Design a protein around this ligand. Structure first.
Ligand SMILES: CCCCCCCCCCCCCCCC(=O)O
Ligand SMILES: CCCCCCCCCCCCCCCC(=O)O
Length: 130
């Protein structure tokens, strides 16, 4: 099962700066990263996920098995222990550091919503070939 598999590129995002400041991303990376159209590569094999996020020079690789403890490297470099769940074939949900993350695939469009208190950081990405 491979619902999420593919390569997607950011089209637009809301509240990037406010969110990244809140979480402790260095200001130099915030300013150089706010206009980056990052690429996310996902390989789904049943419950087993691997994803690679590229933004400029910076590459972050992560993996998890749905419903199990995993260790996710966040944008700051902090690795967090959490559990990622599926809510249907096309929705991944997790919470770490009081952030709720929801990743939802609709055809070729992935919407990622990260909520930290009143800050709702929304990213919309579009499939880019294979
Ligand atoms: C060293 C060159 C500067 C570029 C590095 C800036 C870091 C950009 C990272 C922010 C992109 C946000 C990715 C989050 C993806 C997600 O929603 O899970
Ligand atoms: C890297 C920080 C951890 C993010 C927590 C969500 C983990 C489950 C989602 C994995 C799919 C990744 C899709 C990212 C799409 C995007 O770039 O906005």
């Amino acid at each position: 099962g491979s619902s999420f598999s593919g390569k997607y590129q950011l089209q637009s995002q809301e509240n990037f700066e406010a969110f990244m400041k809140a979480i402790g991303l260095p200001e130099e990376l915030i300013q150089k990263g706010k206009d980056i159209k990052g690429v996310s590569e996902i390989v789904q094999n049943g419950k087993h996920f691997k994803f690679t996020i590229t933004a400029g020079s910076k590459v972050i690789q992560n993996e998890f098995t749905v419903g199990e403890e995993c260790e996710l490297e966040t944008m700051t470099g902090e690795k967090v222990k959490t559990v990622v769940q599926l809510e249907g074939d096309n929705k991944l949900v997790t919470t770490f550091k009081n952030i709720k993350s929801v990743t939802e695939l609709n055809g070729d469009i992935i919407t990622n919503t990260m909520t930290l208190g009143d800050i709702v950081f929304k990213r919309i990405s579009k499939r880019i070939g294979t």
